[PDB]
Design a protein around this ligand. Structure first.
Ligand SMILES: Cc1cc2nc3c(=O)[nH]c(=O)nc-3n(C[C@H](O)[C@H](O)[C@H](O)COP(=O)(O)OP(=O)(O)OC[C@H]3O[C@@H](n4cnc5c(N)ncnc54)[C@H](O)[C@@H]3O)c2cc1C
Ligand SMILES: Cc1cc2nc3c(=O)[nH]c(=O)nc-3n(C[C@H](O)[C@H](O)[C@H](O)COP(=O)(O)OP(=O)(O)OC[C@H]3O[C@@H](n4cnc5c(N)ncnc54)[C@H](O)[C@@H]3O)c2cc1C
Ligand SMILES: C[C@@H](N)CCc1ccccc1
Ligand SMILES: C[C@@H](N)CCc1ccccc1
Lengths: 340, 341
């Protein structure tokens, strides 16, 4: 059984680890390899704000809510462990701010200590009238990617920096199963018109006095198109743009200003914060996560492909539940081949 | 009106600023000076973990509860301001942990979002089975001392290196009023056997991933004799000793160990944290804060002294209320000389 995972972002590596941890002990031989054209720190995952929080509306697919919950429980469970921080993981509390009353989110009971903000808390944020408090987790993309690659490597999973031109090529080269974790670029290997890029730009800043996340919403502009502040492990992420359809990989002057003055008015102490870097990444926006089997016919055999892409602006939030589901589908593939 | 404040720790500079802001306008010529033999970063204040939280038990002087609350509201009112962090101030959330159920603290409604901990929160901290969550404020001693000294300076308040040897000496040199903010050493200038040193040792550590304060309690060993973790503005403070009666200024090995491994057990990610410094300071422990007027006679003239010392392990938590009370007592000194507000 030769399995090639394509993609070395959170989705690819989490899935690779999940498959391997689950089947190494019971299937000889199992050969899992990762192929990608960019590894940390050059993936969208590396640019992620680094916080666990789903969108404010339910998902179309009710499986996604579960995947989000499994991910939180998976991540929470690590708190107490000596290596939580070396995985990119720590607990944070913070605020969600609104210009008007809004319904509770479906995830209110998944986080810790969810409640509405009292009138007294609201005076800390003059521009907003209603909000939430809760405790969630930081999950730093960059650090988590380094952790997962060390955990994969020690288990004998090999990485190959290479650009896949088609599913065909990889199958022809000896893959029995392909796990497709190519993120926003999946369309290059199989056209998918529902998949769009969600261009997000961020400013990273040294401001270690900030201990809380602060996320504002503007209902008339779409999600994450409103200032947001997320303290990371060593730096702070400043955001406020997320526009679908825009394929420009370069930083832009307007979004820089939108992020900087939006965040400087939210958190005026930002005046003394040193800019550390400024980045742009593309969320794999899709009305729903594509996570499914597909049978491909080349040469003399079927090669099974399992897709796992289209996680929009919530891939870190939802990744573990998605990896588990892919390992399930793999298991079905195995019994069909009378392998276990 | 020549006022000498003795002390440049949080209590001293607080009170100085507060008097000055209240009475500069209505009283020329007001001349406020600060005398001290230790300034930042060599004051007890500089060593303070930097968190707002009173003791778990209510104080013998209930006035201290209001002084804590005035302080919190005062500090809170600055959140939203561009300069909150330059003052040493930022909000933080965190946990108070107990091995058994305990009554709610009197300060539960002064903080933000106080509630009990749920079983799931308790799974983060194995050794413990009851506790609180809340939001409070960091007030870094070292930074707040610097902020206050810039504010005082630009108001024309002048600072002098001086080890005062008696109230007499200062009254002889021309002071009409003396504000005594000498912390744990007040007994040198007037014996006060209720005042004892509360030796506290800490390890400062580079661990910027830790965003929450974590304070454990051991109902039997007395307060702050249990591991505690408090993220500061740039570094993290680790503690766990608070020993009354002990005057040894040097760091010792067995308290280092008590702290380090007590805290490594609580927060095991601390294995990767670089040690940046370890320090020892003496909290001015007293059954209650001394904050009162006293008239002393030296030759022909009366000298007015207002004492403000004995703030134990809660001086930052309570300081603004105390400064405001000293300013009230100053007002009454004024009105006794038929001067007006
Ligand atoms: C600014 C910003 C902030 C965000 N913040 C958060 C957050 O705080 N929390 C959260 O949960 N989510 C966040 N997201 C969303 C999250 O970043 C994404 O959902 C996630 O990173 C996507 O993971 P992925 O592994 O699917 O894609 P990627 O991380 O892009 O990985 C794609 C991989 O596929 C490889 N690849 C693709 N095509 C090929 C090919 N043809 N041949 C070889 N290799 C190929 C690439 O080299 C790369 O290794 C954010 C997104 C942005 C843009
Ligand atoms: C390890 C530790 C951690 C702590 N953490 C916290 C915390 O998180 N929150 C909190 O609220 N409290 C905390 N405390 C308590 C807090 O540090 C004190 O309550 C506070 O610093 C007392 O301030 P002060 O100005 O009264 O005294 P100090 O800061 O000691 O200042 C005293 C001043 O008096 C001067 N002085 C004294 N005698 C003379 C003299 N004869 N002539 C001239 N000058 C003189 C000194 O030079 C100095 O300027 C902590 C204490 C310790 C030991
Ligand atoms: C709060 C996070 N779950 C999303 C943050 C984000 C996503 C896309 C662009 C900027 C920020
Ligand atoms: C939460 C703060 N009030 C810490 C106080 C303190 C006092 C003495 C020793 C260590 C810490």
């Amino acid at each position: 059984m030769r399995v090639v995972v394509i993609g070395a972002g959170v989705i690819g590596l989490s899935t690779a680890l999940c498959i391997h941890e689950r089947y190494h002990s019971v299937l000889q031989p199992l050969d899992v390899k990762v192929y990608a054209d960019r590894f940390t720190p050059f993936t969208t995952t590396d640019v992620a704000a680094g916080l666990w929080q789903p969108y404010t509306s339910e998902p179309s697919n009710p499986q996604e809510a579960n995947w989000n919950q499994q991910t939180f429980n998976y991540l929470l469970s690590h708190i107490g462990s000596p290596n939580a921080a070396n995985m990119g993981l720590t607990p944070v509390s913070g605020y969600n701010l609104f210009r008007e009353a809004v319904p509770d989110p479906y995830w209110k009971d998944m986080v810790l200590g969810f409640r509405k903000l009292t009138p007294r808390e609201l005076d800390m944020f003059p521009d907003y009238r209603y909000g939430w408090f809760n405790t969630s987790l930081i999950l730093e993309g960059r650090k988590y990617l380094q952790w997962l690659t060390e955990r994969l490597t020690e288990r004998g999973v090999k990485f190959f920096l290479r650009k896949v031109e088609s599913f065909e090529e990889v199958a022809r080269g000896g893959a029995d199963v392909i796990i497709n974790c190519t993120g926003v670029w999946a369309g290059v290997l199989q056209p998918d018109p529902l998949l769009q890029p969600g261009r997000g730009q961020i400013i990273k800043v040294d401001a270690p006095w900030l201990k809380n996340f602060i996320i504002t919403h503007d209902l008339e502009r779409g999600i994450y198109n409103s200032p947001l502040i997320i303290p990371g492990l060593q730096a702070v992420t400043l955001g406020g743009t997320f526009q679908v359809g825009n394929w420009n990989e370069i930083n832009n002057i307007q979004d820089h200003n939108t992020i900087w003055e939006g965040c400087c008015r939210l958190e005026p102490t930002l005046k003394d914060a040193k800019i550390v870097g400024e980045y742009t990444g593309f969320g794999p926006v899709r009305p729903q996560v594509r996570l499914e089997r597909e049978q491909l016919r080349f040469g003399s055999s079927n090669t099974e492909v399992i897709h796992n892409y289209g996680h929009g602006g919530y891939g870190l939030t939802i990744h573990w539940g998605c990896a588990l589901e892919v390992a399930k589908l793999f298991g079905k593939v195995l019994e069909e081949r009378n392998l276990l």
